[PDB]
Design a protein around this ligand. Sequence first.
Ligand SMILES: [Zn+2]
Lengths: 99, 93, 69, 106, 50
Amino acid sequence: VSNKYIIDATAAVNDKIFDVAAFEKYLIDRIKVDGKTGNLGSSVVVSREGSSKIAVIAHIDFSGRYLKYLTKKFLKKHSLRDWLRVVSTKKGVYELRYY
Amino acid sequence: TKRTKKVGVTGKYGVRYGASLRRDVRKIEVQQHSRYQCPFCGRNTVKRTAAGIWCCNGKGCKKVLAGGAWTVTTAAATSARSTIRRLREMVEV
Amino acid sequence: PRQISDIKQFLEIARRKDATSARIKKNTNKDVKFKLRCSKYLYTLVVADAKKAEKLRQSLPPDLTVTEV
Amino acid sequence: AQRVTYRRRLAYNTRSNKTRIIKTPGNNIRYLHIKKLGTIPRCGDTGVPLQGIPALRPREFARLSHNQKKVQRAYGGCLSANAVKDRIVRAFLIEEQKIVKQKLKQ
Amino acid sequence: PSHKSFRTKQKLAKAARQNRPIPQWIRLRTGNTVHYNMKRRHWRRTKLNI
RNA sequence: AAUCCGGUUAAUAUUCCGGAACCAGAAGGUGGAAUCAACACGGCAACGUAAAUGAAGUUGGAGACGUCGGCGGGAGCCCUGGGAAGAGUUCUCUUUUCUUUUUAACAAACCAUUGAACUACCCUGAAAUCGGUUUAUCCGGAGCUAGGGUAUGGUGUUUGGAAGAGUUCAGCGCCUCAUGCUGAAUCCGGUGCGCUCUCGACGGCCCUUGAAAAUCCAACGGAAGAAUGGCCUUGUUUUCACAUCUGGUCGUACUCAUAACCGCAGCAGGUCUCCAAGGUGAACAGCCUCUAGUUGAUAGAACAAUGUAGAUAAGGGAAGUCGGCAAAAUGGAUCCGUAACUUCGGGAUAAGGAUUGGCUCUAAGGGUUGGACAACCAACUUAGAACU
Ligand SMILES: [Zn+2]
């Protein structure tokens, strides 16, 4: 039982508009398991960075819609909305486009 | 609980129509809504339908009897049956 | 619409004169539907094995008009 | 939610205007006019419904095969099994009573 | 009422045809003074009465 | 007697298009069955089948029927837990909020399984220490309980129809043309004194017992029939299956109303009926909201008297008036209590008193369940306590 949700931001990473380093900590500090947001123990959702594709590995049948919701939360917090929009391409794969 | 001192089935009529009329109706409806015994089946399943027709249910003896308005048999009809029975015997013998 | 489950019965109803056209429908669940358009009824056969489907196609009357949708 | 209209010009809830709600393959909720329920034929001697015969409208019986409208027995599809048995026993006994009456007369 | 007999429909067709504007050349005919006509009927003013 | 789905027009759709069906009528190519002689078999029965000859005459059934009340089932709607796609909000919080997640007629097989009769009938057997059983008291030596069967069978299940349709989302041609092409998802679950419709088994009421006919089916009955050189050849089977042809005529637009009808009118009047979301709430009450519709009732400026409609008013409380006219007052629910009189049924919600919010808890009342225990899921009530 494992999932490999992927979010891609190559549209803004190469343009130096997106901060995956802050996106790492935002996901880590805002992912909620069993109510509280501090239930990360490597037997649960783990985060990984490739400087262009943020990876969320799960073992508790996670949902990608919550991942998209948190990405939109980060988008509005950093005021990158109206320029970047998150869309779905593959199963468990989301990417940011300009539209 | 008794639920009624004397009106009984006429409790549906409330306080109207008069006590004597309610009492007469009470006696009639008590006779009318009574289960009777089929003279051919021996079961207490005879019920009235439409003022003079009496039927009993079951797998057998689905007969329909022509009776009185609210009783299966009336005293006058029983007396007439006895009189006709007597006259028939005198004629035959 | 009627459904058949017998391969030989479908072959006989295909060889029947009233059989005019056949349709091949492939589903995402690796199943092939053979639909025969007769005068009165449309007859559907469901095949789950591609190996059996290939031999069924080969054994089908070549003179019959068969199209794939 | 979706609301439906009559599909015919009869605008009243008559016995001939029975309708059923259907969900078409277009996510459309709409009426479907249906006929009245059929009736099982009744026994001619006791009035009980006849076993083994479907319930259909009078005209629908013309399209059924012969064996679906009857029972393989004397008076099948017209009288019940108990009624047929009672008639057979009653017939035989009364004919016997006639025979013994004639024999006793002679 | 959308449920009309053939006779009713034919009468309605006749009434509709006897409602058009008059061509001017007939009015311009010498010795012909048709000109304007009050025979024009409106559905909301004068009823046909079947 | 018999039709559905999707699409299409500026205006028509169960009528057109595409697909898929059904009914009636007319004639009549097979085919199995049975016959070297008559028109099939199976089941101890209810009864069943792919056909399984049937003229009159007669009989039976369907058509074909009231009303009310409760109970149970189904379809649609409502509600709810996840996943997927898109959108809204994001000072802060919200694994968040909103939209979609669809399967028609027709055909086949099962049908108390998976939900729902012991509903009707049949076989074994013979029951008092009587038993079975509904929410509701009915059933049984005229054969109970129990066991096993038969029939009734869809708005139930699995399929075909049928994903190829429709819906949602996301890209490429970019003057784009007949509007084309390329991608995905359309999934898994649950719930109910819920609403509408319908079906099934019941009960109550009548000095009320709640149409007719066309038409269709079945039965009793036996009119009529002609193969034979043990093997080509015909009569039934077209109430079996499949196949061919035909289905004429009239209506079909639109309004159905605070503007398409009537009222002299684009009149605050009148005119029969179908569908009826969420919350609060007993509720189709009142109030707010979703879908849909409308923002149409000559407008602008200012608040004189008197008006029309709505409110309030110290103290008194009907002194007003023909007259408590009008208005005010009471009002839901729960818990106490309730007189005279009476036709004993009522009066009665008599009269007269107390409580009602929020929050945190407690107790009781019910449904499948691993080795008398018991791990969760899925539910609404009632009562009480503390705090504020
Ligand atoms: Zn009796």
